[PDB]
Amino acid sequence: PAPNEEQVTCLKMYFGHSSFKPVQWKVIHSVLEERRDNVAVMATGYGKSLCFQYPPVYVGKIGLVISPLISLMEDQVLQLKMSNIPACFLGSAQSENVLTDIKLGKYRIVYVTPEYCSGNMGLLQQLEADIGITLIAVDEAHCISGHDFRDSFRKLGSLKTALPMVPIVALTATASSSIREDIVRCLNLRNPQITCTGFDRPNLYLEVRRKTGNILQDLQPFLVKTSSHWEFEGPTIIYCPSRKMTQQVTGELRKLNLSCGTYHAGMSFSTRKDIHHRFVRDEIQCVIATIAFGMGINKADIRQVIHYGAPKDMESYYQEIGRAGRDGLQSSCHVLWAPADINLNRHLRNEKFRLYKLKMMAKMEKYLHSSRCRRQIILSHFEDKQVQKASLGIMGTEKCCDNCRS
């Protein structure tokens, strides 16, 4: 099947896009016409959000979005309103006036937490009967299972029973052929369409280097002197394994009067939002951050990602380097590591998760020591069968990785 004129005019008018990506249309058609439950594993930057934002905008109904990343949900609600798409966050602290506007059908996309959703199942059935619920989205779906687990998700299996004619579309960036199964069981999904995309980001050069023991010695090669001032080549994210390491790296970089901000769960949500927004507005050139639950760094032109210390697992590496080069322009992702890092990772839920993570960590140590193409290694772990001409054209060249360089 193919999109009709009204479909393409809606996508361009409200989202600014000329065409639907292949798996984006496989999910949208399935929800819009077949009303079927969906599981979609798409690459970092592909555009999973359109799969849940577009269908309610086209039919003029309501979409229920469940997402853990509070800060970027606030960015998306503000983003939707700016694109003339009425959207809001529905919670217990929301006004009576905004809640009556939802009951009237004046809001296309409504964002809720798992707790609110379970505690207000009667409102959901009232919205379904009176207005109609196009779909119920579970963003970062790999959490109900896996390299990350959240038990708040478990109380969402009661949604299918209450709303059997409403499709649940669970979207994620990291989920293997076994991960998508336990999501179907915990959500009680009925014969869902299981879709996968290619996993390459060909505009991301890859390099692995050994740590010298001195922070400024390790990071100085990434810095350029512009007038008489030291700075990065462009917007940069430095990922650190601990909140303490984030503080030490920021401390050393501030001796060079570098424009940067730190980002960790030790800071309040308010201080975090400020740093993220200063990074997006290009007021800060570098963010030194830790990968911890509920956090995210969304920017379209990140030119460098530095992992200061060995990454946790292959899912962590993929999910973290995918923040670079969303504009399609040349970017770099460097790992600075030491064997002491991997031993620390060995110590820091279910036994299946532990075995899966330990397998990806042994793969991680192999990846770091390896003399083969970094790009060839990464795509084999996810058994990627959509490794296209664009990827093959970059492999074996200077722009691919450090091991492809002469």
Ligand X SMILES: Fc1ccc(Cn2cnc3ccccc32)cc1
Q: Under the rule (CB under 6 A), what is the footprint of ligand AGS?
A: 17, 20-21, 24, 42, 44-50, 173, 298, 322, 326
End-to-end CA distance of the chain: 47
CA proximity to 134, closest of 108, 153, 157: 108
Give contact residues for Mg ion (rule: CB under 5 A).
48
Residue 327 CB, shortest distance to ligand AGS, in Å, is 8
| Contact yes or no for 28/54 (Cβ under 8 A) | yes
| Contact yes or no for 232/299 (Cβ under 8 A) | no
| Contact yes or no for 306/334 (Cβ under 8 A) | yes
Query: Given the complex with ligand X, which of 128 and 320 has the nearer CB atom?
Result: 320
Closest-by-Cβ residue to ligand X is 382
The verdict on whether residue 277 carries a ligand-binding annotation is no
With CB under 6 A, what is the number of residues at the site for ligand X?
13
Q: What are the Cα distances from residue 33, in Å, to 26, 30, 59, 135?
A: 11, 6, 11, 12
Q: Binders of ligand X among 13-72, rule CB under 6 A?
A: 41
Which partner from the list ligand X, Zn ion, ligand AGS, none does 322 bind, CB cut-off 5 to 8 Å by kind? ligand AGS
Query: Given the complex with ligand X, which of 149 and 222 has the nearer CB atom?
Result: 149
Give contact residues for Zn ion (rule: CB under 5 A).
373, 375, 400-401, 404
The verdict on whether residue 380 carries a ligand-binding annotation is no
Query: Given the complex with Zn ion, which of 241 and 325 has the nearer CB atom?
Result: 325
Residue 40 CB, shortest distance to ligand AGS, in Å, is 10
CA proximity to 177, closest of 319, 313, 41: 41
Query: Given the complex with ligand X, which of 37 and 200 has the nearer CB atom?
Result: 200
Tokens of 200: 């390459």
Q: Is 318 helix (H, G, I), strand (E, B) or coil?
A: helix
Q: What are the Cα distances from residue 236, in Å, to 284, 317, 334?
A: 9, 16, 11
Query: Given the complex with ligand AGS, which of 209 and 299 has the nearer CB atom?
Result: 299
Residue 251 CB, shortest distance to ligand AGS, in Å, is 29
Largest CA distance in the chain: 66
Q: What are the Cα distances from residue 401, in Å, to 175, 206, 276, 303, 331?
A: 25, 4, 29, 15, 11
- Contact flag: residue 356 with ligand X (CB under 6 A): no
CA proximity to 337, closest of 210, 214, 222, 241: 210
User: CA 297, CA 235: separation in Å to the nearest integer?
Assistant: 12
The verdict on whether residue 186 carries a ligand-binding annotation is no
Which partner from the list ligand X, ligand AGS, Mg ion, none does 174 bind, CB cut-off 5 to 8 Å by kind? ligand X
Query: Given the complex with Mg ion, which of 171 and 361 has the nearer CB atom?
Result: 171
The verdict on whether residue 400 carries a ligand-binding annotation is yes
The verdict on whether residue 404 carries a ligand-binding annotation is yes
Query: Given the complex with Mg ion, which of 318 and 367 has the nearer CB atom?
Result: 318
Provide the 10 A C-beta neighbour count for residue 209: 14
Residue 355 CB, shortest distance to ligand X, in Å, is 15
Burial (0-12, 13-18, 19+ Cβ within 10 Å), 174: buried
Tokens of 136: 């119920």
Residues that bind ligand X (CB under 6 A): 41, 173-176, 196, 199, 314-315, 318, 378, 381-382
Binding-site annotation, residues: 17, 19, 21, 24, 45, 373, 400-401, 404
Known binding residues for ATP? 17, 19, 21, 24, 45
Binding-site sequence positions for Zn(2+): 373, 400-401, 404
